[PDB]
Swiss-Prot record:
Protein known as: cAMP and cAMP-inhibited cGMP 3',5'-cyclic phosphodiesterase 10A
Protein task: Plays a role in signal transduction by regulating the intracellular concentration of cyclic nucleotides. Can hydrolyze both cAMP and cGMP, but has higher affinity for cAMP and is more efficient with cAMP as substrate. May play a critical role in regulating cAMP and cGMP levels in the striatum, a region of the brain that contributes to the control of movement and cognition.
Residue numbers of the full-length protein present here: 724 to 1036 of 1055
Binding site for a divalent metal cation 2: D107
Main location: cytoplasm
Length: 313
């Protein structure tokens, strides 16, 4: 009960900042997550025995893929932690509990392939879940882990609080489907500008939590340039593997996934920052002003990709 996690001084300070990198020491990541739950949620939110056993079962069910791995889960949970800490009074006790767990679980059992590859491969998951294929699977896997004996970190919630938290986690994980992001942000953009955005309207909170989930999911683009640049390698390593597997099905993949068109990566990243990342953190910054450092880091990194193209790096 009186057992805090404490981090070394450098981590204790940097962890509060949006651009924190969780480091290459895998065995520190669980403690970093528990640290973040204790400060964000309270030391009483979860039985430490059950949290520790939930965390390690979640770790076991991430695969050794170049990008959609246990490191990504913890990275995405830290971005959510930074947003929650910088927006203290905007979120219910239940939302803080649910969203850190949602981020940790949001890519459970990822195979390193897109929903489109599952559909063209004709994977059994594509027959079980026609849209948001992997994301419905990630929530499925989350519920399964929660139902393992001794792994139910929500056991001390009332029946209705339990149903609400699982509903927050389900919508949160589904929103990480980037196909749903475009319409979600357009709607949030209209609502913000016409002044109809109401955080007491549950349907409105849902859209805002969805944008937060997209923002955390993409948070690789908000780190310092050397972290962003080296993460890009992991991202493209998966894309090019998928491109190879498209060619094995007799389908020319999109250039993003074709390892023969590496040359075009700098222009492809430009399109992604302008079409997805900048709009995402701009709308987020309008709704939640203290998230501005994420938009600022994203712009710095846009400018770094512009420098790569101009041959300057
Ligand atoms: C992980 N994640 N999740 C979704 C996406 C995504 O769609 N990104 C893209 C989108 C469009 N592109 C096209 C080309 C491309 C490359 C070479 C040649 C021709 C075209 N490169 C692109 N990359 C990403 C991503 O890139 N990152 C960075 C942070 C998340
Ligand atoms: Mg995903
Ligand atoms: Zn993800």
């Amino acid at each position: 009960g009186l057992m805090q996690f404490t981090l070394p001084v450098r981590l204790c300070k940097e962890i509060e900042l949006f651009h924190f990198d969780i480091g290459p020491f895998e065995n520190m990541w669980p403690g970093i997550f528990v640290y973040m739950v204790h400060r964000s949620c309270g030391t009483s939110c979860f039985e430490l025995e059950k949290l520790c056993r939930f965390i390690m079962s979640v770790k076991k069910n991430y695969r050794r893929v170049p990008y959609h791995n246990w490191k990504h889960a913890v990275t995405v949970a830290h971005c959510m932690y930074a947003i929650l800490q910088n927006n203290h009074t905007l979120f219910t006790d239940l939302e803080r509990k649910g969203l850190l767990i949602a981020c940790l679980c949001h890519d459970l059992d990822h195979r390193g392939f897109s929903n489109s590859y599952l559909q063209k491969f004709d994977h059994p998951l594509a027959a079980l879940y026609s849209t948001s294929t992997m994301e419905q699977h990630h929530f499925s896997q989350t519920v399964s882990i929660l139902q393992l004996e001794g792994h139910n970190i929500f056991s001390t919630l009332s029946s209705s609080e339990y149903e609400q938290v699982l509903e927050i986690i389900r919508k949160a994980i589904i929103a990480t489907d980037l196909a749903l992001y475009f319409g979600n942000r357009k709607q949030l953009e209209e609502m913000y500008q016409t002044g109809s955005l109401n955080l007491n309207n549950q349907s409105h909170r849902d859209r805002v939590i969805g944008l937060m989930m997209t923002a955390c999911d993409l948070c690789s683009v908000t780190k310092l340039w050397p972290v962003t640049k080296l993460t890009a390698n992991d991202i493209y390593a998966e894309f090019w593997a998928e491109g190879d597997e498209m060619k094995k099905l007799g389908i020319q993949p999109i250039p993003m996934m074709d390892r023969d068109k590496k040359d075009e990566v700098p222009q492809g990243q430009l399109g992604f920052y302008n079409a997805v990342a900048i709009p995402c953190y701009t709308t987020l910054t309008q709704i939640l002003p203290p998230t501005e450092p994420l938009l600022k880091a994203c712009r710095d990194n846009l400018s770094q990709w512009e420098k790569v193209i101009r041959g300057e790096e």
